[PDB]
Subunit: 184 residues, 3 copies
C-alpha cells in the first residue's frame, strides 16, 4: 500500500508566465514517497521508524519556458526554483517538524530547501533520499491493548517554490496522509 | 483495493475567511471508506451487501481560525459545520439514495447531516459507522453469464458544509467511484 | 498496482453553461487504464509491450444539461463532444506519440478523436480498447545491469473536448504517470 497525497493550499499558489507574457499551463506535479513507510492495519495509518531512511521523489513537468512569477505586485522575473519539505503536526498544523538528511558519514543535517533546475518541456525527477524525521510522534504507546486514543501524527509537506524579488511563492504543494513515527 | 474519490463540484464551493477578513488557505479534506466495500474483478466495480455495515472516515484539516463564509451576499458569520452524505444514481445524478445508520438495537434511522466541531490548526477525524444504503442497485442479475448490460450503480457523496444566515454552503465535497449494492 | 492520473492543464479548461445561462457544476471525470500496464519494481515505472493491446475507460458525469461552452469570445453553442488521447514524451512534453487502434483484422489505424454523446444527469462510460503506442521508448536497454540512466518515458493524455464555432475547447483532461514501452 502507498502513501496518498493531496493538493495543499491550492488557493495560495502563484502562477508562471513566459517571455511572451502568456500564462503557462499549470505544471504537472507528482509526489512519491517510495521507501520508508509501512501501513499498519491495526493503527489505520502509515508507520515509520525514526531510525530508518525514507525517500521522496518529485516529478515536475514544466510545460513551456517560465520567466516570471505572477505576484500581488504583478509579474516579477524568476530567480530560481526550490524544493522544500517538512512535517507538520496533525493536531497543530501551524507547527513544523524538521526533516533531516543523514550524510555519507551518518552525521545528520537539517534538510534545507534545495535548488532545482527545471528545463522547459521536460519532466524533471527530483529524488531526495536518506531523510529522517527530527521527532517521534507523541503517544505511540498502546493503552488497554488498543491504540492510544491520544495517538499523534505527522503529515509530510512537499512544495515547489519560486524565488523572485526577495520573496518566495509556492507553485505547487502536496500534503500526505497521517504518519506515526516510532522509536526502536 | 481501495475506493477512489474525486473532487465533487469544486466550482460551487464557498470559501472561509478569518476574523482579520483574510481568506483561509483551502482546508485539507480526505475521505476514506474503510470497511464495507469489495472490488469485483468480473464486475469491474466495487460491491457491497445492503445487509452489511459500511463506514466512512473524513479527515478535515482546518488551517486557521474560520469565522466567515464568503457568499454571493458576501461575508456572513459561521453558525456551524455539517457533514452530509448520500448516494446518487449513476444513471440519474439528480436522484439521491438515502443512507441509513443502524442503531445499537438494529433499528435504522435515516442518516441526517451531523454537526462537527472543527478546532483551528487541527485535523479533525470524523468517523461515521454502521451505515447502509436504503436501496439496492437495479439489474444486478447476470444475463447470459455476463454482467447485465443494464447494471446500475451508486456513487457516494461526502460533503462538508457551513451553515450561515439560514442557508448552506459547501466547503468541500468528494464523490466515490461506482458501487454495486446487492441483496442476500 | 494501478496507473495513477492527475489533472492536466486545469487552468486552460473551458466551462459549460446550460440553457438558462447558468454555469454547470464541474463534470465528474475519471480515467482508468485497465489492461495493458504492469508495474516494474526494478524500473520504478509502469511497463507495457508495444505488441499488446491496452485499454482505457473514461467515466464522464454530466451534471445538468449543457448547451454552451464559455469561451474567450463568450458563450458559444455546443456542436459535440470529443474524446482525445495521445502520448507525450516525458523529456519533450511538446512532442506527441500517436496512439493506434488495431482493427478486427489486425490492421492498425491511428486513433482519431471520437465523438461521444453525454446525456444529462448521467455518467457515461467510454471504453476505448485495442490500443497501441506507435512508438517504443528510447534507451530501454539496461546498462551495467542497472536501468539505463537515459531511460525515456511516455505519459498518456486523455482529454474531453467540446467543439463549438469551429474551434476546440478542453473541458477536462488527465495525464498518467510515466510509462516504459518495450519491444519483444
Amino acid at each position: 500500500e502507498i502513501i496518498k497525497w493531496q493538493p495543499h493550499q491550492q488557493n495560495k499558489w502563484a502562477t508562471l508566465y513566459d517571455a511572451n507574457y502568456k500564462e503557462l499551463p499549470m505544471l504537472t506535479y507528482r509526489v512519491d514517497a517510495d521507501k520508508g513507510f509501512n501501513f499498519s492495519v491495526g493503527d489505520d495509518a502509515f508507520v515509520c521508524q525514526k531510525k530508518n531512511h525514507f525517500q521522496v521523489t518529485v516529478y515536475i513537468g514544466m510545460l513551456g519556458e517560465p520567466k516570471y512569477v505572477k505576484t500581488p505586485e504583478g509579474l516579477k522575473p524568476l530567480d530560481c526554483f526550490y524544493l522544500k519539505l517538512h512535517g507538520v503536526k496533525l493536531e497543530a498544523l501551524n507547527q513544523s517538524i524538521n526533516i533531516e538528511q543523514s550524510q555519507s558519514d551518518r552525521s545528520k543535517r537539517p534538510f534545507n530547501p534545495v535548488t532545482v533546475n527545471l528545463p522547459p518541456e521536460q519532466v524533471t525527477k527530483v529524488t531526495v533520499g536518506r531523510l529522517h524525521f527530527s521527532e517521534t510522534t507523541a503517544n505511540n504507546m498502546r493503552k488497554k491493548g488498543k491504540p492510544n486514543p491520544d495517538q499523534r501524527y505527522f503529515m509530510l509537506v512537499v512544495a515547489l517554490q519560486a524565488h523572485a524579488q526577495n520573496q518566495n511563492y509556492t507553485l505547487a504543494a502536496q500534503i500526505s496522509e497521517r504518519i506515526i513515527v516510532r522509536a526502536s
